[PDB]
Lysine-specific demethylase 3B
Amino acid sequence: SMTSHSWLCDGRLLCLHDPSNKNNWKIFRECWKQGQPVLVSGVHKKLKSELWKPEAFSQEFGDQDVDLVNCRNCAIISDVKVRDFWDGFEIICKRLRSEDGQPMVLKLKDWPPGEDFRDMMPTRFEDLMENLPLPEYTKRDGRLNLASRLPSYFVRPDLGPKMYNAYGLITAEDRRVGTTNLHLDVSDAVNVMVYVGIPIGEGAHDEEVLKTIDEGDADEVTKERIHDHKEKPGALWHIYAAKDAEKIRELLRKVGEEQGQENPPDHDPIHDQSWYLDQTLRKRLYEEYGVQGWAIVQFLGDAVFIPAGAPHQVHNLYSCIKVAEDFVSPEHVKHCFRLT
Ligand SMILES: Nc1cccc(-c2cccnc2)c1
Ligand SMILES: [Cl-]
Ligand SMILES: [Cl-]
Ligand SMILES: [Cl-]
Ligand SMILES: [Cl-]
Ligand SMILES: [Mn+2]
């Protein structure tokens, strides 16, 4: 039967089923007030699917100059064409290769650049903004979005949206690597999975993806969305409550010291955006510091709501196109205040 919602993370994560329901706020707001992330499924069914394909981005924008990042070593690949990224998104034999001759796992950096998304892509901007869930919170002019209503005593988000475009991590060695390392944002945000590319060439890469989700500490119900309904899994997230951010800093200061980094006692390993918490580090965080997180698998069409101040990291399982919009809810406005 079609139902309003369900739970993931053993009851700790709300999953809303109908992205456009007028009454979603009645279920959302208590979870949000408590500082929990929220998942909303089904957003892909509301979009114009032809606007969000890798072939279209290549055809329309392919001649632009860009930098890429090698996810395995964080090396910058300088001054290449946007088509060199997009043409290898799902076809492995077209990907740029490192000097060893292996195809690289790449991220498209700062594209579209800064705040140019709306100017460069006006039809995509309208398609995203009209179909965001919880529109009183997420629209630029929503009644519960304080972004346009606050004085300079508050850090205001940049004009978005932002795209997150990167290949899937492949190997057993790739399991300990981040697509995006651990960090936090002072604004709230909604991150939408608008396309998942499951490759061909090296195709039949199914079983390493299952071992990644298991070792990622995914709950038993999350494991059923694969085996039962065959949805396409895009990325593995870990998210931590904003209240746990300092205990995480204390752990990473200690591990930095153990690995022979030489760091002042006050330096900020979350702001540095240099760490990925692998299975070893997540178990140590739980055992030594008493901190538990949310392990979330974002499928095609899932929107992840990320609370202001909540540390989070992302590990792509397959090639992903994500689009995120920042907002300032009243529940979490304390996180962007510039005093005390
Ligand atoms: N049975 C059913 C099916 C679909 C949406 C809903 C719904 C969602 C959100 C709030 N109120 C109702 C209920
Ligand atoms: Cl467009
Ligand atoms: Cl709403
Ligand atoms: Cl990063
Ligand atoms: Cl909070
Ligand atoms: Mn982020």
